[PDB]
Amino acid sequence: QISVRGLAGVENVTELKKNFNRHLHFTLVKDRNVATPRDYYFALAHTVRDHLVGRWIRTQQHYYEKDPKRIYYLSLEFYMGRTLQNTMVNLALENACDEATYQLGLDMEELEEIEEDAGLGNGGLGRLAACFLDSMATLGLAAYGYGIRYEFGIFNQKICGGWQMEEADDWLRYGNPWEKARPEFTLPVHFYGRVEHTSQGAKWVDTQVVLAMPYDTPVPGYRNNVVNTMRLWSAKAPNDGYIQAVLDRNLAENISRVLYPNDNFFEGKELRLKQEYFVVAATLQDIIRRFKSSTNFDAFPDKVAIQLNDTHPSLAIPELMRVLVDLERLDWDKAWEVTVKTCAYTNHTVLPEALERWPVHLLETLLPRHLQIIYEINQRFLNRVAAAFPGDVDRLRRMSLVEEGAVKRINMAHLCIAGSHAVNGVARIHSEILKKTIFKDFYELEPHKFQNKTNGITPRRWLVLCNPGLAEIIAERIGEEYISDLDQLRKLLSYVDDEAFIRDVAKVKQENKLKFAAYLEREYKVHINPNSLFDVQVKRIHEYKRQLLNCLHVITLYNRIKKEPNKFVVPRTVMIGGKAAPGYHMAKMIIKLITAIGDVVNHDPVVGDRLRVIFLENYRVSLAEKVIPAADLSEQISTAGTEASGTGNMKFMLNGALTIGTMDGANVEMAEEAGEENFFIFGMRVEDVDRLDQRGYNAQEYYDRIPELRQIIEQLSSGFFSPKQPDLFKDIVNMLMHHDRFKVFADYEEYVKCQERVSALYKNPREWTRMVIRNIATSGKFSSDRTIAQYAREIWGVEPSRQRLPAP
Amino acid sequence: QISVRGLAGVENVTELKKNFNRHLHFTLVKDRNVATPRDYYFALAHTVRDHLVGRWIRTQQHYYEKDPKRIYYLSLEFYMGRTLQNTMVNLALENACDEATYQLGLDMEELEEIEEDAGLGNGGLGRLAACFLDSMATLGLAAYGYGIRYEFGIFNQKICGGWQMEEADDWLRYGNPWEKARPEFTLPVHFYGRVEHTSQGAKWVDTQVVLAMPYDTPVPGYRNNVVNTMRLWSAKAPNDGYIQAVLDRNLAENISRVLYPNDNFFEGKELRLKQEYFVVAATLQDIIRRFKSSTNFDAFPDKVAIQLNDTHPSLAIPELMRVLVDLERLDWDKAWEVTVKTCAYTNHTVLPEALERWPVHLLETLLPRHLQIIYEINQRFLNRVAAAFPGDVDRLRRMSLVEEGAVKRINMAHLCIAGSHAVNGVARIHSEILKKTIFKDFYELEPHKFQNKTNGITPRRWLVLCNPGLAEIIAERIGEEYISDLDQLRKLLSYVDDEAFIRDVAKVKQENKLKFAAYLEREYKVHINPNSLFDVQVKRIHEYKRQLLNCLHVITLYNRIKKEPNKFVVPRTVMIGGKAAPGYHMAKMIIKLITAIGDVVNHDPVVGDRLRVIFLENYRVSLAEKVIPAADLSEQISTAGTEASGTGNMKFMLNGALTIGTMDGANVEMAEEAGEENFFIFGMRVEDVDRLDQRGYNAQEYYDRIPELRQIIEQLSSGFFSPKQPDLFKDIVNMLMHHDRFKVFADYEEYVKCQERVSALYKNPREWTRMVIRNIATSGKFSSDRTIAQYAREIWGVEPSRQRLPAP
Ligand SMILES: O=C(NC(=O)c1ccccn1)N[C@@H]1O[C@H](CO)[C@@H](O)[C@H](O)[C@H]1O
Ligand SMILES: O=C(NC(=O)c1ccccn1)N[C@@H]1O[C@H](CO)[C@@H](O)[C@H](O)[C@H]1O
Ligand SMILES: *Cc1c(COP(=O)(O)O)cnc(C)c1O
Ligand SMILES: *Cc1c(COP(=O)(O)O)cnc(C)c1O
């Protein structure tokens, strides 16, 4: 049908049809009389999977022969979403499969909807890992993603009476056609026990053993015949009254049972610590085994790079030391040199409550040898600090890996910096903040360690897959090369005054909005006006992300309409979605508030279809692929200095939405690339927040001086949005008035004014679209291909390649 | 190579090779450079499985079109063993696959050894179900086996210091290529809750829900293109702080976790009750659904037969009543008529400690509606007893389904008889004992209900598969038709004086013994003399099976040798094997005794290779297939009246061993078929046991009057067989002397004398072999094809058919 989806050749279509029928018969054990749509999905998935296999085997064989430096990306989260369409895109099979299925009397799009999301992540950090795997394969790097195969991913969110309910995400129920179990490569992981000191070094004995069984998933590069591996570990009990002993095997296997959904607040739970060590110990054994199958660990850093996705796999540092010292019998200093040159650490937040600080007593019981190694690392590190800054006793306590207090804790971030040759933030402003504030002491000691690597997204999933209409109109003008070289989008600037292109851009957006408007009715029974401005804020629910500020604007628009009903206003559909961490009370209250506002606004006859407020249920990767292409306005309104980067922001920019946002995280670089004239920038900068903190933030001041703000708080307090429970939102009002860490009121005025300017531009479709073109055209920097090339050259010491491997 | 293994045609071999290579590549994601023997096994298994699929789909389609009466075999145990070779045999693919694998440079026999046993049973009852499935498919019956997919089957037995250790049987670790998960046919099962009475009947409310997910395994008939289904249910939690709720799903899923290994003593554990209801509730829903997919339940018994394998699925009776009365709204009397005509019950023991008597309080909590239904069944049943035997108040209490006492219990056997149109024992003597003793009252009320169905074994697994050498020499003389018509073996009587055949029979036995002798060295590092008489007792360890009597004979032979060292004795290898239930202390002591005897006997230089005592570790179906063809003497020495049938006895008879045995279970009919002159029959008959019980059994009498017996007990007591722990076997001596329910001493003299007669015949190879031929030739009655044809005609009301379905 469309050019970017590849050729539908006579031989390929015929071959796909017959392999489809073979799988339906032999693999699923069905015939056309009993087969359900789910059966058809699986037959197609198996058919597409077959095309990966040859390439997968020869890619790994190629790495064995060429022996390049291997990249190991360690993460507790891989937020993969669906695999079928992505695989078709990367193999150039989409049109052929669409044709083959059409001839069998099936709709491929309908079959795609059957696939479960692989929801093995919370949000941005997990999705970054997924985009990174795609880019590493596309750039021909010998890269492996290592994590945990959770049998339950991020919970499915149900909204019941306006409240979030959590439901188990049983994503493996019907099977996963993409993974291959590798029980033959099972490895032991040790827990508890105690340390003995012999004449020949320390020995970790009397341990409990849990088995780590790998499952391999193929990661295809974009049309280069490269297929890399994501290896996820599953926990298994070893085989050695009777009934209870068998039933107690569950305790060992609980390690890989469920993803921790708490992305706001560090909890210090033993099971989470077990998960972190489990992935680290199994992965490092696998790495060392592969390295030996090429005795001298001097070349270890020449052949291995380990990237730590936040501090979650930070135990890699003392585990590598443990193996090198205790098992390989290397001396401390040489083992340390190897460890530092091998490891690199990526930080994803500056918020102190999110930072991992493990109680010493927990590490003492679970990982006694690792604690001893951490103490030794700390002693030697502090000796270096003391020699560099003699007499600076406070610096010593500030930089210690061991934090003092009621409970002694290990600061995992300090451990990561000490044991890594590179530390990076995820956007320029974030990386600067690391050097100036939370890691200032470390920067002063080792300035060379600190880098920036601004985040990106893959344009395969986030343009070609989810927005084929836009990908096509772009390809018509500038060809197809931009898909793996997104900087080529700049060529679109010479079309900003092209009347045909302006019309095509706006048409693609309109089609996307109608498509999503119909999706909302068919699956959720909600009616929206597709002519309205689609105002979208989708991301996890956090106080810092300021969904509450959005809520205040919504109520402001409603109150203005009620005050002057017969005045024209630009119609809006305000959509907010995202999950709240199960333990986060305030975030759960925020969801309730959103739905409560919707209940009043959506049923006011005076409002009509001029304003609609919808809470987008169960926001996840598959939903993002639908809503983002449909959006007109992207809300990126975190308090300056709090969102390390954001990546949702980049997805919207690539897909033809304009951005209203603060100068926070990657928003700064986005505005810089597009030009500030082409962004809706408002609010305090980082410096303004700092000034207000020195003064002391007093919310009462804003309440007293802004009558429109006062009215909203009075409505919240009095029970306007909750007639049956008048004090329902007292916690929210209290926080806003007395305990607001994120200064919602301080940005309110400028936010509302800026929103008026958005409405003004939307009244002029031609000038709106021209600004959109200026955004899409400058979004190239935010490809994860760029990000990964920077990691490769500046951290891992490897060269990317767009050259294809020979096709089987 | 050999005729009975089928044709190895040029096209079939070429096709098998290419499909093997396809699976290795696409299914296993391997190439010849990395592939292990396990990979090769799986590639072959998938290749063979492909040949089943077409036949499986068209068999089920055939049943849909023809709508025959369906047979549902309900069992908590299916002891299947390995599937690969059995499938090749039944599809006539063995030679073709042997050739195909040979040309790929692989040994098929070596690959067969990689397959895990499906050990979903304890012993005879579980293996009977497996043989029955094979025969039902071979006889063209529309039959379904229903059970539980345990993730852990019968434990693997390790012997450590002479003691049994239990190891979890993780049979699914590497995957099961034979099963097909059917998550789309998942059904809810209810537990706990309470009963409400509305105007319109009873309602079971506030229940806990566990999901039942089916897994289907193909059951191929012997060369008739019939492929039936074994459906096994797996427990799943429904999808609806947070972390713990997810982890607690294990509690629901524990239902299908592990097979109860206690085959000696009923325990009354809640988890076992849950397992029993789980299989019953899911199965009955499936049956009713299939019946409706053909409103009037009058025809239900015309289209459905449910066979209860012991009382384990007895809840089928009140569950069917529950569904018909509470859900379908049929009146009680009509529902009862349908239930009785649908259900039939098979009893497998007379030992009172094995009989299921569930505490009322357990049923009250777990299954409150079922208890109410059971009480109502009981009331109406006792009203019939009272009308038939007026004034007989003791009969009323004896026949009650409710047993009185400290704890009230439900007698599940009484429930089964009341609710079934047919009750059968498993051998003629057993069925008679049921009518005369434990179910005498029920027989007097309803004589027409009581039947015999003598057990059998499948000659596919138990001759063709495990003893191809013997199957071939038989086929040379009488053709191949006997394999599905075992009565044809009688034709072999005209070869009893044939010198060529005598030589061939003895040669096949010698080859089997050398094969097994080498197996013992290669896998267990034990040396045996292949010229010795192979004296074998393999079966679960129970007091009633009298492994202890065998032990006494062994010690007698040892003591006789030590007394007269330079006298000639027929050399013997005495092999004993079998598992003890984990809680059965005496059975565990018996295993220790056997190994302890071996430790003394096997290392006595004066004995040499004239006597060897070996404990066969981890006895299971795959081991049975090896040892039985190698045996010369089969030990079937249970106290008369205690072994309901036995089936191991039949396996040995078919494979060319002579039998030393009591007149118990099926031994009686075996001797009858072969002639008593051709069996080594000894010991008390049932009547003799009864006479001794009236007198009172005094073991001291035997100890006082038999000097050889006295010496053995003195050796046991003094610590002759346990020098370091002199009183190790005091429990055994105490039981034998004071508390022996099974009268070991009473059969000792005749046993030893009879064993002398065995040794005498073994000295004359020609006459030994001629007696063997007389046994093999008359073993036809003991085919499960005969057994199943009798069930079909006399209980289920269906006609068997040897006619083949058209090949795809
Ligand atoms: O998503 C997360 N963390 C978590 O999900 C998380 C999970 C467990 C504990 C702490 N945390 N972090 C996000 O990472 C993205 C990628 O760099 C950035 O764009 C976002 O600015 C950042 O908030
Ligand atoms: O094997 C068993 N029971 C068990 O395994 C068992 C399991 C649980 C509870 C009670 N029991 N029973 C056996 O059944 C065979 C088939 O009819 C007969 O040949 C044997 O004589 C009989 O002992
Ligand atoms: C991109 C993405 C995120 C990250 O969004 P931010 O706005 O950067 O927090 C979270 N969840 C999903 C499903 C995503 O796709
Ligand atoms: C046949 C068989 C049995 C039954 O043997 P009996 O001697 O009849 O108790 C038990 N276990 C296995 C593995 C069998 O094959």
DSSP notation for A71-129: EEEE-S-EEEE--HHHHHHHHT-HHHHHHHHHHTT--HHHHHTTSPPEEES-SHHHHHH
Rg (CA), chain A: 27
Distance CA B282, CA B232 (A): 10
Ligand 4 atom 1 nearest Cα: B648
Residue type, A171: W
Answer yes or no: are the C-beta atoms of A15 and A21 closer than 8 Å: no
How many Cβ pairs closer than 8 A exist between chain A and B? 95
Domain A1-456+784-808 in CATH 3.40.50.2000? The answer is yes
Judged by a CB distance cut-off of 8 A, whether residue B269 touches chain A is yes
Distance CA B342, CA B302 (A): 8
Length, in residues, of chain A: 808
Answer yes or no: are the C-beta atoms of A703 and A713 closer than 8 Å: yes
Answer yes or no: are the C-beta atoms of B91 and B49 closer than 8 Å: no
Distance CA A641, CA A689 (A): 8
Strands (E), B591-741: 611-616, 633-636, 658-661, 680-681
Distance CA A646, CA A664 (A): 9
Taking an 8 Å cut-off on Cβ atoms, the answer to whether A29 and B53 are in contact is: yes
Token pair, residue B551, equals: 């032990």
Token pair, residue B203, equals: 């309602």
Query: Which of A136, A172, A134 lies closest to A151 in space, CA to CA?
Result: A172
Distance CA A787, CA A799 (A): 13
Distance CA A32, CA A19 (A): 14
Q: With H, G, I as helix, E, B as strand and everything else as coil, classify residue B603.
A: coil
Q: B1-456+784-808 with B457-783: one CATH topology?
A: yes
Residue B704: exposure state from Cβ atoms within 10 A (0-12, 13-18, ≥19) = exposed
Distance CA B355, CA B349 (A): 8
Give one DSSP letter per residue of B332-397, joined into a string. Answer: HHHHHHHHHHHEEEE-----GGGS-EEEHHHHHHH-HHHHHHHHHHHHHHHHHHHHHSTT-HHHHH
The residue numbers preceding gaps of C to N over 2.5 A in chain B are 240, 294
The region, left, alpha or beta by phi > 0 then psi within -120 to 50, assigned to residue B140 is left
Answer yes or no: are the C-beta atoms of B446 and B473 closer than 8 Å: no
Residue type, B124: G
Query: Which residue ranges of A are tagged as binding site for AMP?
Result: 31, 64, 289-294
Token pair, residue A442, equals: 């470390």
Torsion on CA atoms A488, A489, A495, A499, rounded to nearest 10? 140
A interface mutation test: which of B63, B243, B290 has the most A CBs within 10 A?
Answer: B243
Token pair, residue A744, equals: 């919602």
Ligand 3 centroid–CA A651 distance in Å is: 9
Partners of residue A228 on adjacent β-strands: A219
- Choosing from A122, A259, A538 the residue with most ligand 3 atoms within 8 A of its CB, the one to mutate for a pocket test is A538
- Find the CB nearest B168 among A173, A180, A239: A239
- Find the CB nearest A242 among B36, B237, B261: B261
**Fold designation for B457-783:** Rossmann fold (3.40.50)
Cβ-based neighbour number of residue B571 at 10 Å: 16
CA distances from A283 to A76, A235, A508, A679, B272 (A): 12, 13, 45, 44, 40
Beta-carbon contacts of residue B654 (< 8 Å; ≥ 6 apart): B457, B459, B462, B463, B776, B779, B782
The DSSP 8-state label assigned to residue B324 in this structure reads I
Q: State the residue for tokens 């044991």.
A: A419
Ligand 4 centroid–CA B540 distance in Å is: 7
Cβ-based neighbour number of residue A690 at 10 Å: 14
Distance CA B379, CA B391 (A): 16
Residues of A in contact with B245 (CB under 8 A): 168
CA distances from B91 to B4, B97, B133, B328, B661 (A): 12, 11, 16, 43, 37
Distance CA B681, CA B750 (A): 9
Ligand 2 centroid–CA B493 distance in Å is: 33
Answer yes or no: are the C-beta atoms of A224 and A55 closer than 8 Å: no
Distance CA A221, CA A412 (A): 34
Judged by a CB distance cut-off of 8 A, whether residue B704 touches chain A is no
Q: Active-site residue numbers of B?
A: 348, 539-540, 545, 647, 651
Residue A790: in which H helix or E strand, if any?
Answer: helix A784-791
Q: In what order do the strands lie in the sheet with B357-359?
A: B357-359, B409-411, B402-403
Partners of residue A198 on adjacent β-strands: A201
Residue A287: in which H helix or E strand, if any?
Answer: helix A270-292
Residue B147: in which H helix or E strand, if any?
Answer: strand B143-148
> Where in chain A are the domains?
1-456+784-808, 457-783
Residues of B in contact with A582 (CB under 8 A): 241-242
Residue B485: exposure state from Cβ atoms within 10 A (0-12, 13-18, ≥19) = middle
Distance CA A457, CA A81 (A): 14
Residue A524: exposure state from Cβ atoms within 10 A (0-12, 13-18, ≥19) = exposed
Token pair, residue A512, equals: 């996307």
Token pair, residue A196, equals: 């003995």
Distance CA A374, CA A377 (A): 5
Partners of residue B71 on adjacent β-strands: B143, B305
Answer yes or no: are the C-beta atoms of B548 and B744 closer than 8 Å: yes
Q: With H, G, I as helix, E, B as strand and everything else as coil, classify residue A55.
A: helix
Q: State the residue for tokens 């004589």.
A: B447
Query: Which of A537, A550, A582 lies closest to A263 in space, CA to CA?
Result: A582
Query: Which of A435, A774, A718 lies closest to A600 in space, CA to CA?
Result: A718
Length, in residues, of chain B: 808
Residues of A in contact with B179 (CB under 8 A): none
Q: From the centroid of its chain, how far is CA A556?
A: 32
Beta-carbon contacts of residue A422 (< 8 Å; ≥ 6 apart): A344, A345, A449, A451, A794, A795
- Encode A534-552: b = buried (16+ Cβ within 10 Å), e = exposed: bbbbbbbbbbbbbbbbbbb
Distance CA A126, CA A261 (A): 11
Residue type, A634: S
Q: What angle do CA B74, B76, B77 make, to 5 degrees?
A: 105
Give one DSSP letter per residue of A220-245, joined into a string. Answer: E-SSS--EEEEEEEEEE-----HHHH
Cβ-based neighbour number of residue B85 at 10 Å: 23
Give, to the nearest 10 degrees, the angle between helix A10-22 and helix A37-66.
110
Ligand 3 near A81 CB (within 6 A): no
Answer yes or no: are the C-beta atoms of B78 and B129 closer than 8 Å: yes
Residue A692: phi, psi to the nearest 5?
A: -70, -35
Helix, strand and coil content of chain A, in percent to the nearest 5, comes to 55, 15, 30
Partners of residue A572 on adjacent β-strands: A533, A611
Token pair, residue B24, equals: 């290795």
Distance CA A214, CA A278 (A): 12
- Choosing from B538, B542, B626, B784 the residue with most ligand 4 atoms within 8 A of its CB, the one to mutate for a pocket test is B538
Answer yes or no: are the C-beta atoms of A130 and A782 closer than 8 Å: no
Cβ-based neighbour number of residue B133 at 10 Å: 27
Residue B487: phi, psi to the nearest 5?
A: -60, -25
The DSSP 8-state label assigned to residue B426 in this structure reads S
Judged by a CB distance cut-off of 8 A, whether residue A808 touches chain B is no
Token pair, residue B126, equals: 């579980």
Ligand 3 near A539 CB (within 6 A): yes
Q: State the residue for tokens 């003793």.
A: B437
Distance CA B377, CA B315 (A): 13
Query: Which of A609, A611, A646, A616 lies closest to A630 in space, CA to CA?
Result: A616
B interface mutation test: which of A28, A62, A242 has the most B CBs within 10 A?
Answer: A242
Cβ-based neighbour number of residue A722 at 10 Å: 18
Answer yes or no: are the C-beta atoms of B395 and B445 closer than 8 Å: no
Answer yes or no: are the C-beta atoms of B515 and B469 closer than 8 Å: no
Taking an 8 Å cut-off on Cβ atoms, the answer to whether A247 and B240 are in contact is: no
Residue B94: exposure state from Cβ atoms within 10 A (0-12, 13-18, ≥19) = buried
The DSSP 8-state label assigned to residue A508 in this structure reads H
Cβ-based neighbour number of residue A738 at 10 Å: 10
Token pair, residue A293, equals: 């199958």
Q: Active-site residue numbers of A?
A: 348, 539-540, 545, 647, 651
Give, to the nearest 10 degrees, the angle between helix A94-103 and helix A10-22.
60
Ligand 3 near A651 CB (within 6 A): yes
Half-sphere CA count of B722, side-chain side, radius 13 A: 19
Token pair, residue A355, equals: 């930072």
Atom of ligand 1 nearest to the CA of A646: 19
B-facing residues of A in 576-605 (CB < 8 A) are 582-583
Distance CA B591, CA B589 (A): 5
The DSSP 8-state label assigned to residue B258 in this structure reads B
Residue B794: in which H helix or E strand, if any?
Answer: none
Residues of B in contact with A272 (CB under 8 A): none
Answer yes or no: are the C-beta atoms of A457 and A784 closer than 8 Å: yes
Answer yes or no: are the C-beta atoms of A337 and A420 closer than 8 Å: no
Residue type, B168: A
Strands (E), A153-226: 156-160, 163-167, 180-181, 187-191, 194-198, 201-205, 208-220
Ligand 3 near A123 CB (within 6 A): yes
Token pair, residue A100, equals: 């083959």
Judged by a CB distance cut-off of 8 A, whether residue B180 touches chain A is yes
Query: Which residue ranges of B are tagged as binding site for AMP?
Result: 31, 64, 289-294
Query: Which of B379, B423, B711, B776 lies closest to B563 in space, CA to CA?
Result: B711
Answer yes or no: are the C-beta atoms of B451 and B424 closer than 8 Å: yes
User: What resolution, expressed in A, was reported for this entry?
Assistant: 2.0
Q: State the residue for tokens 């009057």.
A: B705
Answer yes or no: are the C-beta atoms of A400 and A383 closer than 8 Å: no
CA distances from B212 to A85, B231, B304 (A): 32, 11, 21
Judged by a CB distance cut-off of 8 A, whether residue A329 touches chain B is no
Beta-carbon contacts of residue B403 (< 8 Å; ≥ 6 apart): B357, B409, B410, B411
- Choosing from A348, A645, A667 the residue with most ligand 1 atoms within 8 A of its CB, the one to mutate for a pocket test is A348
Answer yes or no: are the C-beta atoms of B604 and B629 closer than 8 Å: no
